[PDB]
Amino acid sequence: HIQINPSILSADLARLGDDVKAVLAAGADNIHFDVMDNHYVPNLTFGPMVLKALRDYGITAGMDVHLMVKPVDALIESFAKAGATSIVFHPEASEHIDRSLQLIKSFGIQAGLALNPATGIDCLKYVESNIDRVLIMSVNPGFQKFIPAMLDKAKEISKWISSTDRDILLEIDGGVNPYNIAEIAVCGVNAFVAGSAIFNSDSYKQTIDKMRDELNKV
Amino acid sequence: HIQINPSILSADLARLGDDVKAVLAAGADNIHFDVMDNHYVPNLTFGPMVLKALRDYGITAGMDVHLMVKPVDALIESFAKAGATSIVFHPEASEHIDRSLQLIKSFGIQAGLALNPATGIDCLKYVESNIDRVLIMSVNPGFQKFIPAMLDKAKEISKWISSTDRDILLEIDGGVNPYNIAEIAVCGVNAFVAGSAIFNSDSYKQTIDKMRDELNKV
Amino acid sequence: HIQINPSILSADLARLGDDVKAVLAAGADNIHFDVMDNHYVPNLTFGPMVLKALRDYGITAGMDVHLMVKPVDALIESFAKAGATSIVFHPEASEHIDRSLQLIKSFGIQAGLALNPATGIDCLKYVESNIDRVLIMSVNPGFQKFIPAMLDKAKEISKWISSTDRDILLEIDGGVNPYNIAEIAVCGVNAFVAGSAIFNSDSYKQTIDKMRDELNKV
Amino acid sequence: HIQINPSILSADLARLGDDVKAVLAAGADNIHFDVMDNHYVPNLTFGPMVLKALRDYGITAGMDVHLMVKPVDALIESFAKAGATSIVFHPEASEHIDRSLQLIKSFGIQAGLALNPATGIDCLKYVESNIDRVLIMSVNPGFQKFIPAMLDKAKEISKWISSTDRDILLEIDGGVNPYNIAEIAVCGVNAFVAGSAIFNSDSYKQTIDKMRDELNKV
Amino acid sequence: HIQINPSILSADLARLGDDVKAVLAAGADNIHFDVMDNHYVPNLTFGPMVLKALRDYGITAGMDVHLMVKPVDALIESFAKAGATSIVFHPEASEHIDRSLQLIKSFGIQAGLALNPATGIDCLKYVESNIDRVLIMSVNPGFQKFIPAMLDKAKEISKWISSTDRDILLEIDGGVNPYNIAEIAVCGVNAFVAGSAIFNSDSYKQTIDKMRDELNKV
Amino acid sequence: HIQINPSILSADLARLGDDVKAVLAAGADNIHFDVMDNHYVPNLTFGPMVLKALRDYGITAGMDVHLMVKPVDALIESFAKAGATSIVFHPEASEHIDRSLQLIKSFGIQAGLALNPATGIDCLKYVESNIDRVLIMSVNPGFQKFIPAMLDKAKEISKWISSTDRDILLEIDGGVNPYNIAEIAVCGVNAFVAGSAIFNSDSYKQTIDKMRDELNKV
Amino acid sequence: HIQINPSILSADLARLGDDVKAVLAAGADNIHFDVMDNHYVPNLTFGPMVLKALRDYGITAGMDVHLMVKPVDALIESFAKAGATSIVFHPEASEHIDRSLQLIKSFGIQAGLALNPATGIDCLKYVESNIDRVLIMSVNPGFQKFIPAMLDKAKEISKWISSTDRDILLEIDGGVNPYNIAEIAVCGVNAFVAGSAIFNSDSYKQTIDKMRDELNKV
Amino acid sequence: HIQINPSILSADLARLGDDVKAVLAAGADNIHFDVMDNHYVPNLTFGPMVLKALRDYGITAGMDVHLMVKPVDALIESFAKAGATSIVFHPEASEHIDRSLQLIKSFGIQAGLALNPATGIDCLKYVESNIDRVLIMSVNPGFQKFIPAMLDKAKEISKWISSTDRDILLEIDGGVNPYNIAEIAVCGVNAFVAGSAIFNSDSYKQTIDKMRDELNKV
Amino acid sequence: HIQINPSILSADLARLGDDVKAVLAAGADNIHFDVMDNHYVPNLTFGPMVLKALRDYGITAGMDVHLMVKPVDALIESFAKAGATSIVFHPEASEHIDRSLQLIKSFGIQAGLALNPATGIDCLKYVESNIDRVLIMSVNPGFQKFIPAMLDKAKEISKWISSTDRDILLEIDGGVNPYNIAEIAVCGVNAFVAGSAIFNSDSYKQTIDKMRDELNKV
Ligand SMILES: [Cl-]
Ligand SMILES: [Cl-]
Ligand SMILES: [Cl-]
Ligand SMILES: [Cl-]
Ligand SMILES: [Cl-]
Ligand SMILES: [Cl-]
Ligand SMILES: [Cl-]
Ligand SMILES: [Cl-]
Ligand SMILES: [Cl-]
Ligand SMILES: [Cl-]
Ligand SMILES: [Cl-]
Ligand SMILES: [Cl-]
Ligand SMILES: [Cl-]
Ligand SMILES: [Cl-]
Ligand SMILES: [Cl-]
Ligand SMILES: [Cl-]
Ligand SMILES: [Cl-]
Ligand SMILES: [Cl-]
């Protein structure tokens, strides 16, 4: 089952619980958090207390955290404790990648790595046993249009995933919309983060249905 | 230079010369004719007299003919005489593919083959010397959304083209729009037929500029 | 689970409901319809009203339709509406293979292609997403002994199926009997159409049991 | 032993027995019949009664029939009964290629397939056991100069033939003459159909001797 | 045409305009700036105002900037605005390699990456579309003799460049002189940065001519 | 553009200037000199003074020299000084192949190697940088019919040429005529030396036009 | 000869000379220093003065330094001057890997790289000439049980080492004990760092003998 | 789920039911019987009556039999009748390997082969359909320390298992303990027989938990 | 240990013993003799009596003879008897290469082959057992600058040498100097002949030391 995981960075941050509840009622799968610390990428978004606030509001859906921060261990711990169901970080952001993946897994949740557009897949080779998911960035994080060179990367990561025999989710984030989602999905991507395409549309339900329709034909 | 070739089937057929002149003034390269005979595909569009009419109106731009007809030789001759600058037909539509390509070339114009979504590239192997262009159909002809399985076909045809050392244009037709054009272009496609995306838009200029912008980044 | 799908063309057409009910009670899985239009193959068998008649009689088992007809779209629609659970047709019989597969799938049922003995597997490449099953003909349709050259074809199709990671049923039809079924099954075939071997035998139960016994040892 | 098989289409049709007897006395091996029905190719040549007439005249040499007709089964039967020693037809011309090859073989004679210039060799794969010969067309049938792209096809068919371990004759037809015959023979061709080069020459003997001389040096 | 691009770090910094004008009159192609910020490498050289000063002096030749700085975006902008015609930076020096390449290209100039001796070519894979040139460092930046292990790297980068079909300049910098330049050029290098070998020689003209002579024989 | 280079050995040696002027006016590209010293091959043809005589007569077309002599350096120098535009020699004829190629190039003209029928292409490997052209002999020099085994050699040399990325002319000499020229051209040959086929024909213009016609279809 | 190199971090730091002398008398080969600066890894261990102190105490055995520090050059110099016989550092810890390896070698001692569990072997490719040894970390540095994924890494590094024809020591550090040492050794590892397994055991001699016994059977 | 199958040969044979019940209550999966006949290996252990005795005692857990006997058929029958859930034997111990595997399967239980350290995997090739499990011996049967050369064998058998698409358990027996179990598991082993490591430990629960902990991290 | 073997052709031939003694005292390894007979190459140098004269003078260093003569056997014998320690000759210079190598070896000294720039390595294949060394000529013998195309040849010969498992010295001669020696050495060359670079320098010691310094870093 292909996941549609709306990115809350594009939601109504003044009525976040309400907007999240609505997007989930409209067919979304998990809620996605693009966490930025103004150092690894040039913006600052939201901390673990926002995730905790959504748990207290009653959101029970999965909460996927993408850490665009450096270093990463303190935030792995606080987001895990706040209620994250998965956490991914960038290999370049940790001086001990394997230890950071193990730390995530010590909380009984999904761990993985996020890759900037220029970043290859060699970082996955030796930490395979601690990879539950991979996140492909298809825009320059914290700065757009989907970067088409990422289709081949998704194909290469799919191949690697198949060679492991493990269930590893392949997700993408950056410029995803109903018009390019099928083209990305044929490359092996099973999870899609969308912000603007969903939260800025007149009807979350209709947008998510259009996406599902394209995906069902891949 | 990547070509943007508007398909006149989507234009104002009651003011065709005017609409064609406008799309060319807005940045289009060549005018594309999707010719259907109600037999090879289930609709009927326009004959060689429409192309001749545009020549008499003063259109000097290239006129690319895609024959979705069967058989094909009589129409190759009439479209060539009317002023076509290129003609492509489907291999399944001729009982003498090589002879039909030679016939097109006897008029001093570009020849090639158009491939339905299910059709592979083996048909190109032995007629290589008479292939100036290949047209990939990315929708079911005469019946939609771009068929994502066609990205890999475009990659395979690009590879074949590279192996020949000849200049062979790789074109695509079916559901092309500003949101998926870059994803198709990274697969080796150099020419894009667009109908609805251009002719049904408020500004031909702005639509064509958006397309050029995405293409310039591939 | 390997399927044994009796072909009703060999059944008692004067007491069809009764014969079908009996073969299903004896261990058969699905009922197979070899539909011929006297044009694609040189005989005429039965139309969609026969399938509907079996539904009205109370047969709830799967009903697999093999269209040995040309063209195919009108019959896809009528067999689907009559209650077919799967439909396959020959690639050579449609001028728009992908569209015909999509049409079958629009009815919420299984789609696929049937291949004559001389026909290779290149036709499966670009329509993969719309293939739920493949039918190998092991006799010359509408005209016998199993054609042994089909074992290697079954092996090649099995390999292709494995490379897709999708669940695609591999079925065979033509001269299947208890003495050659194990030899066909070791080549990757999971579904067997048998007519004469079952319907002309003294005991459907014993014949089907003999088949199951050979299959259980592959 | 390389065969030189004159095509009677170029002979004196008003004194056919006499011209055939002369070409055989001059060193020809078999008599070749290019049969056209005005449908598969755009001309009409001769029926089975012409072959029978040559048998009644006393010609005992092999009579090779190339069917450029569609459909093909009725003519396979009549040419076989008239006294043909081999029959080849085009795969595209039969809806049941394997059955048509079997039909030819049921008469105790050689069977095979003829390939138009654009046609590849995939059609030979699954009918191998019923292929005694392959005919490469090196001109557009029923419409010339030898098409040089056919040299590589002959090389590929030779390779396929070697991989089978069976004795399969590789023949070519179209624009063969004493000046290009050696170049075709080095590609694995063992039988040559020549019409004009032989029948329009001043001396059949000298022309056939020149051909033999070039062939003996390959 | 092979480029000889003198590095101004070796020029007379007290009479820079004069020395640059002289080296260009002697046959040099472009002027090369090795920019160091005392952080990425252990020295400090010159800022964008030196490049601007040369533009104001009347130098119209290409000005190639090699940024041995970290981070890189602010300097990309200032060197571009000062009049640079190309800018390269080290992948390790940016946390957003693709974004930094795009930034360079937003100024309408050439972009690329510079590689330290230990750095491999995997960084080029996913940013290919934004690479106009690659700079191989053949000495330890900011610290010599040409490092011979770089010949194989140049061969590997040449191969990669050929596989892209794009025109990508392959340049080298570090210990280049008339005695080793031909050996580097046979490995696929098309542009040579030389400092000491040119600026410390008695005659710029004779040194550049000697270099051209060796290069013309590769 | 494919070259047709008539060999003057077949021209009217008593009215050479006149015959050369006529063949060039009829469409020939360059004039070819097959120089023999009675030692490397068993005949003696013409020295550098004949080439000089043609320059003095006013022939400005390219003059290609094929040295079938041993040793070769003195004749390289005299033919170059007489006005040759290219010189090729046989590797077996020089004890210093690289030096001999360099000598040719020292005159600012094209250099290359000529290969006897038995000679392979290993001689080209290490002198690549000094090879502007390769001449395939398709008859036994100084002694005929085109040797068909040379088609595969031309294919292998074409492949080697493609692997170098350099522009290297591939020429052939020996038994070339209008009937076999297309078959040779499909193997990658771009230049054709013809003697008898042109100079012994009734009309140089018509012969050269026939050749061009066959070549235009490859 | 396989090395057993006890890590002093596990020794009695209050009676270090005595404990080192004892472990060497018990069969140890070299003394291993895991140097941490609280920045590259989250602990602080010991500086060059501890190594010097052991030299002054009379320890003449080899002293291998593993720098888990960033940056690394100042410590390379001080550890070398204190009496180190080998120094390895992490590629990620230096902005000039080749220069840092050269610096180590300038002291006439062994140089190499240490790899964290997630780190691949691409860093070794271009600095090969300056690599005398490689250290595989089999635990997360400065934070355990041997990480089994490191066996395959050791196999890949062994293969690389064999391809160089140079003598490069392959060492491992992290969770090594008598029960897993043979399993690591069959993967090509020739040197073993052990801390706890040796220094916390009742008899250094018996522990080292047990290790030798397992190693002798690989 | 990875299996931990204690070998009863190391249990308290005077209180076997009690010791087995305890090890199962402590987390063990199946009970393993290493059956020796003093001929195939140099010791004698226990017959089918011991297994029956455990069934009568109330042990309902799986009972895996490893026959280190020769010949094997009589014992296959008696162990099956006594209540074995799987039986493996050595290929060298039967003169009819396929028949012996079929015999095991005739009892409706799992069959497979056990391999001595020197024995390769070719024996599995043709009996694949009757292989439910493979047992790797990692010590010399009936005579120790784990033989490290068996890691590569486990990798090769895992690869073979993957190529079959069947669910085949890969088990190992000989010198397995908590310190080497993770290293064996990364090679594809899913079932572990342990005797001494479990039955001679102070707490079965703690030992089995330690094993599970290492396995959970692979 | 890399050899530096000065070529006496560049020494003071009027004070040869003195110049040789000096170059050896300055760090040279062996003395190299480039012997030319005015036939194989266009100069005449020195005969075996010069080598004997150096032996009588007291030179005990190795004396390597490179025969650029044709034929070669008489000179092999006289140079061997005069005191040569190795002799190499060109394959093209002997009609019995294997016999000539055996002749050299019959004197108990090293034998090998010298290769002109154009000459490939196929000549080494079948005489491998009699090859102790290979000499690559990097200039045109007896006529310069190092020919850069020879780097790849050295790489190919190194590979061949590695495949033999024998100790075969790889030497180079022609245009070697301190500025290109490291670049040649990274390609697998272990011995360097230098004439001018050493004998025309102010200090043999300093030149040889500079060479050693570059070589020590490869
Ligand atoms: Cl941290
Ligand atoms: Cl780490
Ligand atoms: Cl037609
Ligand atoms: Cl045709
Ligand atoms: Cl239809
Ligand atoms: Cl279609
Ligand atoms: Cl028919
Ligand atoms: Cl059929
Ligand atoms: Cl920045
Ligand atoms: Cl980025
Ligand atoms: Cl000479
Ligand atoms: Cl030479
Ligand atoms: Cl530092
Ligand atoms: Cl560096
Ligand atoms: Cl038995
Ligand atoms: Cl057996
Ligand atoms: Cl001799
Ligand atoms: Cl010999």
Side-chain angles (χ1 to χ4, degrees), chain C residues 169-213:
Chain C
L169 188 71
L170 181 52
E171 190 169 40
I172 200 156
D173 181 3
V176 181
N177 62 54
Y179 305 95
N180 60 16
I181 196 169
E183 292 61 36
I184 301 165
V186 283
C187 295
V189 178
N190 332 110
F192 298 87
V193 172
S196 185
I198 298 180
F199 286 112
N200 297 332
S201 70
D202 292 350
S203 170
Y204 304 161
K205 171 72 166 180
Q206 296 180 37
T207 293
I208 292 172
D209 289 349
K210 287 190 63 180
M211 288 177 171
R212 294 292 181 193
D213 290 334

Side-chain angles (χ1 to χ4, degrees), chain F residues 17-90:
Chain F
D18 178 77
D19 213 10
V20 163
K21 183 172 63 182
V23 83
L24 292 169
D29 293 298
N30 304 280
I31 301 301
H32 184 87
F33 295 75
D34 275 337
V35 179
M36 307 183 190
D37 70 353
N38 206 45
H39 283 75
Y40 188 63
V41 293
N43 209 348
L44 188 59
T45 59
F46 30 64
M49 60 291 298
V50 175
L51 191 157
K52 180 62 171 59
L54 286 170
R55 284 301 184 208
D56 296 342
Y57 177 91
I59 304 304
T60 59
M63 290 180 184
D64 301 317
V65 173
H66 170 209
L67 296 178
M68 287 166 279
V69 311
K70 178 185 179 184
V72 306
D73 291 358
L75 288 171
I76 283 171
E77 297 183 25
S78 60
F79 276 95
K81 295 176 193 168
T85 49
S86 77
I87 300 173
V88 300
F89 66 90
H90 295 249

Side-chain angles (χ1 to χ4, degrees), chain A residues 39-40 117 122 140 143 153, chain E residues 95 98-99 102 122 126-127:
Chain A
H39 283 75
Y40 188 63
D122 288 335
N140 294 124
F143 282 94
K153 191 184 298 187
Chain E
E95 295 190 308
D98 203 37
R99 195 274 169 169
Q102 286 174 334
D122 288 335
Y126 295 106
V127 297

